[PDB]
């Protein structure tokens, strides 16, 4: 899940 | 059945598992109830990512029913010990113990998916433990300590006063993503990144 995780 | 995929570069070919690819990206996956088995694995994973790149953030994906208290505090301490910041993401639920780990992420980096849910309740004992009153008196004393300790830990991470936590956790409290954000358990709710939308 980027941004922001990662 | 979980399929494995294959990646290739000028240096060679690599066949890998989806969970390995996630860990390669510094993503630890907690998908199961918290127990000695699961806890030890997560602590090991955390300490490894610490060794490789202590300066880079670690990510924790959480979908869990929750689990044991000692197992929870084992993970919690390890999370807080590690030098790297820890990002927590909740998928589909984080309940009881798992809700604490979700809240135990470093401030601003705690998040959840929109339809995920969060459960908070006080520690419970499903079975029955028997013995002389002297023994039960000691167990009950410990049980209250574990209760209060969960309340204090939740209090400082959520920002709520310990008294409020104790009151809210007396009965099971289910929170949506947005409701969990307002409570102070998570900082933000992830939005769909899709292109067509």
């Amino acid at each position: 899940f980027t941004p922001x995780a990662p | 059945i979980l399929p494995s995929f294959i990646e290739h570069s000028s240096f060679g070919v690599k066949e890998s598992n989806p969970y390995n690819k996630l860990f390669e990206e510094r993503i630890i996956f907690l998908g199961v109830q918290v127990d000695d088995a699961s806890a030890n694995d997560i602590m090991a994973q955390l300490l490894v990512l610490e060794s490789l790149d202590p300066d880079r953030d670690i990510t924790m994906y959480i979908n869990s029913p929750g689990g044991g208290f000692t197992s929870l505090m084992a993970i919690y301490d390890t999370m807080q010990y590690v030098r790297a910041d820890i990002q927590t993401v909740c998928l589909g639920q984080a309940a009881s113990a798992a809700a604490v780990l979700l809240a135990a992420g470093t401030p601003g980096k705690r998040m959840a998916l929109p339809n995920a849910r969060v459960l908070i309740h006080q520690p419970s004992l499903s079975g029955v433990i028997q013995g002389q009153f002297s023994d039960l008196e000691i167990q009950a004393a410990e049980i209250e300590r574990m209760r209060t300790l969960m309340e204090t830990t939740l209090a400082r991470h959520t920002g709520k006063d310990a008294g409020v936590i104790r009151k809210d956790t007396d009965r099971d409290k289910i929170l949506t993503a947005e409701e969990a954000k307002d409570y102070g358990i998570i900082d933000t709710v992830l939005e769909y990144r899709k292109l067509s939308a």
Binding site: - | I129, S134, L136, A140
Partner: protein, 174 residues
Amino acid sequence: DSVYERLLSERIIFLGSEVNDEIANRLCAQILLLAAEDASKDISLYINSPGGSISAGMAIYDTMVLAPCDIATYAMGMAASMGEFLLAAGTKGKRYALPHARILMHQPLGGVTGSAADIAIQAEQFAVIKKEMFRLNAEFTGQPIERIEADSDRDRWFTAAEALEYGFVDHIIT
């Protein structure tokens, strides 16, 4: 089995098994019925028991005290937990024991379950019961509450002679 009926005619009730609600109800009933027939004559309770629930036990005890007649207690094979308690609860001087009878006294044994909140409540009661049991056992035996609590920490067995000294029973039966 017909012998228990023959004993009832002699105003003897027998506690031969662990104390539970079922036995307590029957014992309490028999005592009230016996007191109704004749309130002057004593009632004899023969006790061989492993012990049992406190709540069921105290139903019997309360009924004993309220009875107009004296309640004589005999320790036959064994008296433990409620067995010891009811034995000592007998009318003072009318408490008897057989030579090889053994008396057991110990701390209460409960259990805890549920939420930390529910267990907290269960623990409160444990403190209440524990105090009340030791108080009455102290009263029956004539020992200080401190010694009852101290001796009751772990299982403490008494022989007929040792029980005679501690104040559980007044006499040994020859």
